């Protein structure tokens, strides 16, 4: 929802054993890209196979013979692959062990990666993975991926074959040791449906056009993110046939789920906030393109546990600290974001989250002023606002006099306000402590980071823990941040010569 | 379904349901339209404001602020209104302060000795009235106390008696 996808394409993830389309192009005459895949059966049986790959679009029309075809619009956009014997007839595959190489594809935008500094380039937005096998024998699964059965035994107590039973809710809930209300609380495919803030604009009528019919927001947009890994074909209940059944269950998603629900037991949280927090973390990390369980994630959970316990920190808060605020809710409540701003109507217009900017430095333009004032409605004093805003603008890289009505600005501000407030420190004071710790005031304005060049000045989490500790020490010693900073020479005291 | 069927039974003259409040069949059946709660007033003012927004579009003035229309629509009697004035009024009310007091205290000079104009303007603030109402009340009279023409003037005219007045 946050970007257009009307034009986009796919490229082969660069790998030394695969050759093919590595860059997107605005136009081509070729019906399909050609790909060649080098692979080896564990017998060191090594072969290469050609394959065809093509971007494909599909659309619908009514037989309204009176109007012209009026076709131009955003449209569903999909990827199709096809092997043919005609391109690989020589390979004579009868005896070869059936197992061969991985295949991977980036779904990618192509744009000036620096709208100023040119860089018109294709650039990824999603990644996906496949394994290819070749077996003239029409071999069995026990030949193809025998490891699966061992997995299903150890993790499901069953043969991989038993998945075909597991597809039904009864077998599923049984083997999982779960009751189906939990499952709908997981799937949101029934009444536990997602909800969206009315006051928020989206990048494209991806779902706004006439023929759009995906229920919006989708579970793969919210609440079902990690388990569906953003794939449009999300898992759902489906009407029965000799009992109720599940939409679609790749073993990949099955093992994701197997992990997920155990973690859910241990943390004791509803699925929506768990998924929310999890995605917030993994998407904040630039490295985890693959929605993978990783150390910073675990570390984040540790922090949440601790802070939730000590200060009753709501996971939404934590999530919107390390990532954007969420314009969504589960079926039953107002969205955290909209609650925070349109908490009540005090003006004519509700506050709304939009593209565009305003001259926050003075905002003499009535509308700009209105916007800024509504934002100042975020608890803090107007004067405080001006201490914060230049730092936010600078950290985000915006034009000095301007700010924009987007989550980035919002979240930055929210961090800077809320975090010290959790320690009862004024947002003003926070700047002082941050400089003391880092010689930077705007530190929390920045986005979280997990830089491999790990240094003390980088871990948000450690820094937060330090803020905690030192705050305790300060109050323990009956000190004051201003006094401390002055004594430490962080700021000069006002003096002048005298008679 | 029942009403939908009944409304098929003729009498095109009738103000059929969807001629009004056409949003109603458009509402989605869902868990939240069921479970979550809101003030009735919110809906009332919403639907009504929607109607008004359409009407101002019929005035070809959708470019105008709907609120702002109330800034000068003099009829009916209660119609002329000003949101910012109300906001100020209640704001200072919550502070337990009068605007006149605020301005009077904001003057650099001492209240016990400061310009007449400031006294004037402060007192006007103490009126609590909006500038719009002020202007309306300030308008000059449209009609002469009486009006006559040669017909009745030839027929002769009698004023009311007068000695009774004091």
């Amino acid at each position: 929802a946050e970007k257009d996808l009307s034009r986009h394409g796919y490229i082969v993830k660069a790998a030394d054993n695969i050759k093919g389309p590595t860059q997107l192009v605005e136009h081509s005459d070729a019906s399909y890209d050609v790909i060649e895949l080098t692979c080896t059966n564990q017998a060191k049986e090594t072969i290469t196979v050609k394959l065809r790959g093509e971007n494909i679009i599909t659309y619908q029309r009514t037989k309204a013979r009176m109007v012209p075809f009026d076709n131009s619009s955003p449209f569903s956009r999909q990827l199709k692959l096809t092997f043919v014997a005609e391109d690989n007839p020589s390979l004579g595959n009868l005896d070869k062990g059936p197992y061969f190489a991985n295949m991977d594809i980036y779904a990618a935008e192509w744009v000036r990666e620096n709208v100023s500094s040119e860089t018109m380039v294709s650039r990824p937005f999603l990644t996906m993975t496949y394994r290819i096998a070749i077996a003239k024998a029409g071999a069995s699964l026990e030949e193809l991926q025998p490891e699966a059965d061992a997995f299903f035994i150890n993790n499901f107590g069953l043969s991989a074959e038993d998945s075909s039973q597991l597809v039904k809710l009864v077998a599923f809930g049984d083997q999982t040791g779960s009751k189906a209300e939990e499952i709908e609380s997981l799937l949101s495919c029934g009444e536990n449906l997602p909800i969206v803030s009315p006051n928020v604009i989206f990048a494209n009528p991806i779902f706004g056009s006439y023929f759009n019919d995906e229920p919006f927001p989708a579970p793969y947009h919210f609440g079902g993110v990690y388990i569906n890994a953003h794939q449009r074909n999300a898992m759902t209940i489906i009407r029965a046939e000799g009992g109720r059944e599940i939409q679609s269950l790749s073993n990949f998603r099955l093992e994701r789920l197997n992990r997920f629900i155990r973690l859910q037991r241990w943390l004791d949280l509803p699925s929506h906030q768990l998924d929310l927090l999890l995605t917030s973390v993994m998407q904040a990390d630039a490295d985890n393109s693959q929605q993978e369980i990783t150390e910073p994630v675990l570390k984040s959970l540790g922090l949440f546990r601790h802070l939730n316990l000590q200060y009753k920190i709501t996971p939404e808060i934590f999530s919107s600290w390390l990532y954007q605020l969420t314009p969504f809710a589960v079926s039953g409540e107002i969205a955290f974001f909209d609650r925070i701003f349109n908490r009540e109507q005090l003006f004519d217009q509700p506050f709304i989250l939009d593209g565009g900017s305003f001259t926050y430095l003075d905002a003499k333009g009535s509308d700009a002023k209105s916007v800024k004032q509504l934002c100042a409605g975020l608890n803090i004093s107007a004067v405080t606002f001006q201490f914060i805003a230049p730092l936010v603008q600078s950290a985000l890289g915006l034009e000095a006099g301007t700010l924009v009505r987007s989550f980035e600005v919002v979240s930055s501000l929210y961090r800077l306000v809320s975090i010290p407030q959790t320690f009862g420190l004024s947002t003003e004071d926070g700047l002082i402590l941050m400089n003391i710790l880092t010689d930077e005031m705007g530190y929390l304005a920045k986005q979280p980071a997990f830089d491999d060049k790990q240094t003390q000045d980088k871990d948000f989490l450690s820094i937060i823990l330090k803020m905690e500790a030192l705050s305790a020490w300060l109050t323990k010693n009956n000190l004051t941040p201003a006094s401390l900073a002055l004594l430490l020479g962080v700021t000069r005291l006002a003096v002048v010569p005298t008679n | 379904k029942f009403i939908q069927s009944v409304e098929l039974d003729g009498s095109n003259q009738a103000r059929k349901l969807e001629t009004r409040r056409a949003d109603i069949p458009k509402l989605s059946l869902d868990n939240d339209a069921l479970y979550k709660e809101v003030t009735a007033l919110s809906i009332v003012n919403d639907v009504l404001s929607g109607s008004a927004r359409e009407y101002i579009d019929q005035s070809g003035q959708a470019d105008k602020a709907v609120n702002q229309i109330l800034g000068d629509t003099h009829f009916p009697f209660t119609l002329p209104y000003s949101l910012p004035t109300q906001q100020i009024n209640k704001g200072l009310g919550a502070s337990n302060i009068e605007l006149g007091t605020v301005i009077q205290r904001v003057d650099p000079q001492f209240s016990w000795n400061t310009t007449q104009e400031k006294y004037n303007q402060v007192l006007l603030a103490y009126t609590q009235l909006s500038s719009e109402q002020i202007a309306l009340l300030s308008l000059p009279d449209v009609f002469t106390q009486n009006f006559l023409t040669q017909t009745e003037l030839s027929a002769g005219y009698l004023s009311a008696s007068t000695t009774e007045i004091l």
Binding site: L169, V170, G173, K179, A180, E181, I183, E184, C189, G190, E191, L193, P215, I237, I238, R239, G243, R244 | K1, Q4, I24, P25, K26, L27, S28, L29, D30, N31
Partner: peptide, 27 residues
């Protein structure tokens, strides 16, 4: 009574407007 039929009871739903339902409920 054995065990309550929870799983078997589990609800499936898709939202609609009243207009949608009215059309859908045609023969």
């Amino acid at each position: 009574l054995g065990r309550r039929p929870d799983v078997q009871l589990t609800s499936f739903w898709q939202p609609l407007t009243l207009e949608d339902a009215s059309y859908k409920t045609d023969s």
